Design a protein around this nucleic acid. Structure first.
Ligand SMILES: [Mg+2]
Ligand SMILES: [Mg+2]
Ligand SMILES: [Mg+2]
Ligand SMILES: [Mg+2]
Ligand SMILES: [Mg+2]
Ligand SMILES: [Mg+2]
Ligand SMILES: [Mg+2]
Ligand SMILES: [Mg+2]
Ligand SMILES: [Mg+2]
Ligand SMILES: [Mg+2]
Ligand SMILES: [Mg+2]
Ligand SMILES: [Mg+2]
Ligand SMILES: [Mg+2]
Ligand SMILES: [Mg+2]
Ligand SMILES: [Mg+2]
Ligand SMILES: [Mg+2]
Lengths: 176, 322, 392, 45, 236, 117, 101
RNA sequence: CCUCCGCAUAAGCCUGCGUCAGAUACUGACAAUUAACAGCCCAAUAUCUACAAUCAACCAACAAGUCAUUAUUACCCUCACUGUCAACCCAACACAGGCAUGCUCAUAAGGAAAGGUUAAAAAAAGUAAAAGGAACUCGGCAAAUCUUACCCC
RNA sequence: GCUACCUAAGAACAGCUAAAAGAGCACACCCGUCUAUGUAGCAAAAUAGUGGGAAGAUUUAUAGGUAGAGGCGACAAACCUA
RNA sequence: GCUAAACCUAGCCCCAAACCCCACCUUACUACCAGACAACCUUAGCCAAACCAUUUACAUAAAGUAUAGGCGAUA
């Protein structure tokens, strides 16, 4: 029912609503996959209720009662997602040895920068895909000068940072 | 800029909103060879007639029911002409447009350089009834003009936009299906076919089981009000010259299997605020719950044909001017 | 001279790398890279085909492998076939003898004043005015709108005679009805797949017009040939077809007997609109096709002289001009060029009205021609009503 | 009389100075590279 | 530029084909020919200049019927819709070509000379010497390329060896294999030469933009040049 | 003339505005007449469990012991799932123990991942 | 779900199922008068109205009759001290009409 | 009292006189534009498609023209996504300029030339003018009337 | 994205005289003859009046094309982002 | 006595050392359909020669030497 989008009617208007601690990753790791699946929707309903409270508080130009529980719920959901992702990653590594769920490859783009191109799902092979063939994954010789220039810009920035750090350290040592 | 009112509408509870826009009160109810011919039309459009191209569900309505309703109207008119002399001279129109433009209520412009200025709420109905019958002699009033009914017209507490309803600025048309020069200016019956988007199955899937009757009722109210208002304004009446006699019309709205019957009496064209401030008149729409003409069609046989529905159609066609 | 210029023709693939030509070594291509690079050899990708069947991305098998492909070419006449020689070509194809003017049997059905509709002139004028001026909100309705409307309104006006003729309750006006009929002429396999216009369908067959003596007399008549134009011109040559005689309805259908094929040329554009001769030829061919389908259904697929000739009427129109046809099929032995021949009575270019003025023409602020039809000819509607009443 | 030489139209804008057109030719690729080297927040138009 | 020639149709047809003007611009987009641009929109009618093109599965001489003679926007001469067997095609109409006429196209070179009849196509070797011809082919089966404008008529001068000598409308002589086909008579619209434009607007309608306003000095080329007639152009 | 503002479907002519979306994943395709055919299998089906009797509230009691974080690893999962069976059958064909040579043929293929979340 | 690659569907394939939904919605007070049966939500931009219908019917068991959506444009007019425009995020607004009256 | 207008669509722009609160058509917050209108389309392989438009009927044409399928094979089983606000765009500006289309053809819609006073010169716009009527001036420029005839190109 | 020309497919042209007209008067629309004002202006070329065309070699919306040793040009050394 | 005045560190310069989730080439930041299209080719000119036309530079020491060069500017 729509009443699940709002806090308890008794809690309505309360300046402060007491809440427990956010779920921890270690605590969640002990729960079964079905238990985590159910807790995900429990936390999702709580998160929807708290976001509703936040938006209504903004509308009414009033502080949200106990704003910290929204952060607690977000942290709990993040921990649950991390636990599920850890389990999926472990299973994937065991069964296939792949450390990434999505296929990809290190490729040199048209600008000469090495990127991790993440493969997309297609129904036809790449040699037939027209748009993919239009996309270019190689850098022509004229890009080498710009690659060198970018490298030198990065080197200058790094040198400035390091020299400034050394200057500040020397000033600190002299002061103390 | 004016709200475009769609008779066949996906909007929920659109019947009440149309009742408000029209000042209409809805009332439940009404104020052998033919069976063979109806079954013949059904079987012609379902089984007998060979289709070169495969028929898909999304086009089943257009390629089955629409020819079926056309055949029903034509054959029934031909067969009932002996029993209804006026029906002989009547003009039968297929998908001829029916346009009605009117003004109902006022609104303060919310925003813009015209904010705070009073502006009339204009509505335009552009219907395309699958079939319709037009005559030269007006039908008799179903109930005397100034018929006071205790039921109160629904009121809308929000803007018409909130019901899915959008404004446009195009030609304002008042059209009965033929130009004013056509002698056959009064209406007799409108046969409407609901579109595929408004299928009973689709509504059931969308959890709109309560809205089948709403769809039929809204289509009836809108289409019949537009037709009667167009007839009245062809006769010369308008908001400041409200009709001196009721303008009657009938409609049958079908989804292909389920039929519903509606009778509409226009008693008021004074829908604007100025002309409605002290107007006791209110239009009336009698309607019946949708009933299935047949249960199912298996190959060469139609199961559970509804003689009551067929006789309802026959009675509407047999209604005559006085 | 070859049509299609090189710049528009598909570009030739670039020449293969010499690494492929060299026998003993395996070329290094960018296939492993999964993308093109200009400094590696171009892969030779094996042909690809999606494993599963996918509509919306489906390629048909090459034509010769279609199950219905046949070396013998069937020439099909459909709703959008415009014969070059027109009436002569249709008569040769259908093995028909032409008679100018409708038969006396049908023409006399309107001579008696009782069959005459009350206020024929006024009612037909009203029908024309509604079709051409009052039909829609548009100031000048187009042919695509006023041709079907005028035909339907005339049919309704005729149907109003149910009071006088109760036999008119045994007929219906079916739409979207399509028929198919095949036959041989001089070893040429000709099919007619007629669709489009409306079909009046009766519960009883139409009475024969011509007598057996006239049918025999048709033997002496010789089909007018035309050279070098072949009778096949303008007919769709088709090598992938199915020889079948279909009446368009399942067996047991009420109102089985065709009575009038109402054909309408509702194209707005003159080039897209049939010429009068081509429309008459189309009427001939569709009437012959319906009659032949009826004959094949009734007396079987036997090439023989029909003991009970099949009569089919047809009314072609363009909204203003009409053409009336009564076709008597009295023989299914079409292959032979000699013998008894079908016969068609034709009345051509019967114009219901000379012109219609949607707007009042004004010269020097003076109305020269008022709004409405000009040159109305009630004789055309009398012929229309005669055809409608025939058989009742 | 003058001054209003810019008659905006997004189709022309993107077809004249868009990312796709800039990458179409090697010169435009170098234009994009120059913008990247300078640190422009808007490489293309 | 992205110019693509509109002449991409591969299958012959009778329907007028929707053209695309060039304005004298090459495929690169630059003006290659001046004075071309605008004019009334036109549709191309595919002309079958190979008059002897026996229909598929057929061979030998064949006749055809002239359905109509029609003005052609793309050509000085008017065309004719000629239909034979189970096909139709556009051809170049001769002077006295009316609808309903019969046109014979043959590849037979008889020992004697065929009685020349205007509008029919015969091998040049089959024509009597001195007959007026048009739509001549450079090579056997190449297709008509010469004497195609309105009112143009070539002359059959000699038939030495297996070759025929043709006086072109420019009076140049042309040696072609006698097997190459040419139609009898002069091209239609003979009065095209006496057409008065009347107004610059009609030139613009036809699609000819006005000449450049820049003034050019006339060089040595300008003076009237009287030259001997060029030698025969041979294709054997 | 605005280059620093994000390109959205609200900018451009009718064609641009209609063509560009807002990231919503497609649900079906378009056929002749612009009719949209929606494929049910392309609509994400929320697999919502039965929460009746569930004892895990969104928050955790503050009176709960604190435990060190031990992120799950492939080695730990193998030890806790496969190692016991391996030991038992060694004291007494890895598919019997659980290894799957290929992800093909599974509804939920681990790589390339073919399931949501 | 959002910010996840949807497994590509081919004809005859299995149903697309999401187990841990990533969409989080807000029930907001309408800023204008609305019908009694209408509920206003603020939705992630990647959520379709079909997705919202299934979301409400499965997670909350709310009988949904109709759903409409619109993309509200957040103001980009505001500027910080550096004269750089501050973009108010755009958000999707969904109007849900309840069923069974 | 004015009304060139105005209302919509297109294009452009992108929240840019909605509410609340602070300041002193600004700032911050809150809200909003809901699809039917429009965009976003089409399974192949061949094969068809001479006969303008102009009320399309006479006629008259020339500059020769926007508007069509069939045959077989596939295929239905399941209404998404996006635009929707404004006093608005291009001209550095709340710029007397530029700005496509449909209706309204003077309006039902949209607006205010005067911040207040005085009524000097000079200046701008306009109206009236005794008698004369080009005597002005390079020239009847301007204004007023409606006005002949002859040349050059 | 102005402008010169061109390509694709569009749109506009009241009323009157005449009659199938690069016809006449005349709106919209395009242009810019002459005068006045303005000259840091309302305007980096405008305003008011006046005037030329206004069914055509017309005007014009959209998209595309021709690029500087160049393009385009009814040659004004015109126009090609003031 | 108002506008205002000042201020010290944000950083920078030169060296040494040392080598450096999802979306996005279609209208970029756009889940999801038969491609074929692919890069390489002398710098020139200003300027100096008082013009300009051949010509005109791009560790130490040998040495500004041998040589080149409108045998001259210079190299
Ligand atoms: Mg422009
Ligand atoms: Mg000259
Ligand atoms: Mg929407
Ligand atoms: Mg003022
Ligand atoms: Mg003052
Ligand atoms: Mg005076
Ligand atoms: Mg003087
Ligand atoms: Mg004088
Ligand atoms: Mg003087
Ligand atoms: Mg003057
Ligand atoms: Mg005019
Ligand atoms: Mg003129
Ligand atoms: Mg000059
Ligand atoms: Mg000069
Ligand atoms: Mg020098
Ligand atoms: Mg010096």
């Amino acid at each position: 029912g729509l009443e699940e989008f709002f806090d308890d009617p008794k809690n309505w208007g309360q300046e402060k609503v007491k809440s427990g601690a956010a779920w921890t990753c270690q605590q969640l790791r002990n729960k079964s996959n079905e238990d985590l699946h159910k807790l995900w929707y429990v936390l999702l309903k709580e998160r929807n209720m708290l976001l509703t409270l936040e938006q209504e508080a903004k509308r009414q130009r009033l502080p949200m009662p106990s704003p910290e529980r929204l952060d607690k719920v977000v942290d709990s959901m993040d921990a649950l997602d991390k636990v599920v992702q850890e389990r999926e990653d472990a299973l994937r590594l065991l069964q296939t040895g792949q450390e990434r769920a999505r296929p990809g490859a290190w490729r040199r783009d048209i600008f000469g920068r090495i990127i991790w191109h993440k493969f997309k799902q297609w129904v036809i092979p790449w040699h037939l895909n027209k748009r993919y063939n239009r996309k270019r994954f190689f850098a022509l010789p004229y890009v080498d000068h710009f690659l060198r220039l970018e490298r030198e810009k990065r080197a200058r920035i790094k040198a400035r940072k390091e020299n400034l750090e050394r200057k500040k350290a020397k000033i600190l040592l002299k002061k103390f | 800029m004016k709200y475009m009112v769609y008779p066949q509408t996906f909007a929920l509870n659109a019947d009440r909103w149309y009742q408000y826009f029209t000042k209409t009160v809805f009332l439940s109810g009404l104020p052998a060879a033919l069976r063979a011919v109806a079954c013949d039309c059904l079987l012609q459009e379902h089984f007998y007639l060979r289709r070169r191209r495969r028929v898909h569900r999304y086009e089943e309505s257009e390629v089955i029911s629409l020819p079926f309703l056309d055949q029903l109207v034509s054959t029934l008119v031909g067969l009932l002409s002996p029993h209804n002399p006026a029906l002989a001279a009547a003009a039968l129109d297929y998908r001829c447009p029916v346009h009605f433009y009117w003004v109902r209520g006022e609104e303060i412009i919310p925003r813009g350089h015209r904010r705070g200025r009073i502006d009339d709420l204009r509505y335009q109905i552009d219907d395309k009834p699958n079939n319709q019958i037009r005559i030269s002699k007006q039908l008799a009033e179903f109930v005397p003009l100034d018929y006071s009914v205790p039921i109160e017209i629904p009121t809308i507490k929000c803007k018409p936009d909130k019901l899915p309803l959008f404004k446009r600025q195009y030609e304002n048309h008042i059209f009965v299906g033929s130009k004013t020069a056509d002698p056959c200016c009064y209406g007799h019956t409108q046969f409407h076919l609901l579109p595929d988007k408004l299928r009973r199955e689709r509504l059931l899937r969308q959890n709109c089981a309560d809205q089948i009757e709403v769809v039929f009722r809204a289509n009836a109210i809108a289409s019949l009000f537009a037709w009667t208002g167009a007839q009245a304004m062809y006769q010369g009446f308008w908001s400041e010259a409200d009709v001196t006699r009721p303008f009657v019309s009938q409609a049958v709205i079908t989804d292909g299997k389920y039929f519903s019957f509606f009778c509409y009496q226009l008693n008021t064209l004074a829908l604007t605020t100025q002309a409605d401030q002290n107007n006791p008149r209110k239009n009336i729409c009698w309607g019946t719950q949708s009933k299935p003409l047949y249960e199912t069609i298996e190959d060469n046989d139609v199961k559970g044909f509804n003689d009551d529905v067929l006789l309802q159609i026959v009675h509407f066609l047999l209604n005559r001017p006085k | 001279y070859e049509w299609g210029v090189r710049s528009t023709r598909k570009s030739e693939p670039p020449p293969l790398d010499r690494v492929y030509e060299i026998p003993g070594l395996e070329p290094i291509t960018f296939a492993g890279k999964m993308h093109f690079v200009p400094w590696l050899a171009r892969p030779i990708f094996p042909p690809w085909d999606r494993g599963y069947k996918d509509p919306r991305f489906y390629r048909s098998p090459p034509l010769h492998e279609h199950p219905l492909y046949k070396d013998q070419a069937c020439y099909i006449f459909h709703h959008r076939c415009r014969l070059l020689e027109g009436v002569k070509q249709a008569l040769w194809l259908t093995k028909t003898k032409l008679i100018e003017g409708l038969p006396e049997k049908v023409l006399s059905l309107v001579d008696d004043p009782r069959n005459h509709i009350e206020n024929q002139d006024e009612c037909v004028l009203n029908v024309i005015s509604h079709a051409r001026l009052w039909q829609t909100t548009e100031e000048i309705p187009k042919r695509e709108t006023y041709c079907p409307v005028i035909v339907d309104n005339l049919i309704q006006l005729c149907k109003s005679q149910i009071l006088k003729h109760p036999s008119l309750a045994r007929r219906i006006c079916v739409q979207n009805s399509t028929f198919s009929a095949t036959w041989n002429r001089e070893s040429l396999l000709l099919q007619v797949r007629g669709s489009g216009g409306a079909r009046l369908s009766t519960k009883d067959p139409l009475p024969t017009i011509a007598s057996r003596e006239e049918i025999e007399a048709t033997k002496n008549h010789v089909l007018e040939t035309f050279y070098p134009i072949s009778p096949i011109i303008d007919l769709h040559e088709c090598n992938i077809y199915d020889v079948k005689n279909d009446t368009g309805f399942q067996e047991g259908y009420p109102y089985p007997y065709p009575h009038t094929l109402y054909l309408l040329d509702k194209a707005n554009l003159r080039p897209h609109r049939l010429q009068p001769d081509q429309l008459r030829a189309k009427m001939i061919l569709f009437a012959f096709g319906s009659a032949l389908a009826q004959a094949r259904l009734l007396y079987g697929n036997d090439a023989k002289v029909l003991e009970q000739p099949v009569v089919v009427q047809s009314v072609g129109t363009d909204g203003r001009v009409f053409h009336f046809l009564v076709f008597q099929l009295n023989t299914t032995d079409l292959d032979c060029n000699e013998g008894v021949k079908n016969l068609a009575w034709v009345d051509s270019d019967q114009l219901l009205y000379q012109h219609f003025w949607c707007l009042p023409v004004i010269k020097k602020r003076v109305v020269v021609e008022p709004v409405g039809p000009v040159g109305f000819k009630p004789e055309t509607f009398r012929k229309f009503l005669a055809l409608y009443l025939h058989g009742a | 009389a003058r001054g209003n030489e810019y008659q905006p139209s997004n189709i022309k804008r993107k077809n004249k100075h868009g990312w796709v057109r800039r990458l179409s030719t090697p010169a435009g690729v170098q234009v994009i590279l120059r913008r990247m080297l300078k640190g422009r927040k808007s490489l293309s138009h | 530029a992205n110019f693509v020639s509109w002449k991409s149709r591969t299958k012959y047809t009778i329907t007028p084909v929707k053209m695309r003007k060039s304005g004298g611009r090459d495929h690169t987009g630059r003006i290659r020919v001046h004075g071309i641009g605008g004019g009334h929109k036109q549709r191309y009618r595919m002309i079958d200049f190979l008059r002897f093109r026996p229909e598929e599965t057929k061979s030998g001489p064949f006749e055809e019927k002239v359905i109509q003679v029609r003005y052609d926007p793309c050509r000085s001469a008017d065309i004719a819709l000629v239909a034979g067997g189970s096909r139709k095609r556009w051809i170049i109409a001769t002077e006295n070509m009316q609808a309903g006429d019969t046109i014979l196209n043959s590849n037979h070179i008889g020992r004697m000379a065929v009685a020349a009849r205007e509008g029919d196509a015969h091998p040049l070797g089959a024509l009597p010497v001195g007959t007026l011809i048009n739509n001549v082919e450079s090579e056997p089966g190449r297709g008509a390329q010469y004497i195609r404008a309105a009112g143009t008529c070539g002359v059959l001068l000699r038939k030495v060896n297996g070759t025929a000598i043709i006086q072109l409308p420019s009076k140049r002589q042309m040696q072609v294999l006698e097997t190459c086909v040419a139609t009898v008579g002069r091209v239609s619209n003979v009065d095209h030469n006496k057409r008065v434009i009347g107004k610059a607007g009609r030139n613009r309608w036809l699609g000819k933009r006005p000449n450049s306003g820049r003034w050019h000095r006339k060089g040595g080329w300008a003076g009237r040049k009287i030259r001997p007639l060029p030698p025969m152009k041979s294709y054997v | 003339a605005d280059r620093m503002s994000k390109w959205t479907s609200k900018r451009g002519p009718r064609s641009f505005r209609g063509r560009k979306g807002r990231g919503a994943k497609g649900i079906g395709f378009l056929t002749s007449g612009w009719r949209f055919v929606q494929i049910k299998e392309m609509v994400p089906e929320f697999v919502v469990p039965d929460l009746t009797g569930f004892k895990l509230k969104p928050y955790v009691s503050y009176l709960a012991p604190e435990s060190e974080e031990t992120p799950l690893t492939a080695a730990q999962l193998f030890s806790e799932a496969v190692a016991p069976a391996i030991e038992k059958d060694f004291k007494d064909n890895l598919e019997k123990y659980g290894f799957e040579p290929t992800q093909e043929g599974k509804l939920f293929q681990l790589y390339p991942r073919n399931f949501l979340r | 779900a959002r910010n996840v690659v949807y497994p590509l569907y081919r004809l005859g394939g299995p149903q697309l199922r999401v187990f841990r939904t990533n969409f989080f919605i807000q029930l907001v007070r309408p800023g204008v008068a609305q019908p009694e049966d209408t509920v206003q939500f603020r939705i992630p931009m990647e959520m379709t109205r079909v997705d919202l219908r299934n979301y409400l019917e499965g997670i909350y068991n709310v009988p949904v009759a109709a759903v409409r959506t619109r993309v509200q444009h957040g103001s980009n007019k505001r500027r910080d001290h550096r004269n750089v425009r501050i973009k108010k995020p755009d958000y999707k607004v969904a109007y849900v009409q309840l069923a069974h009256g």
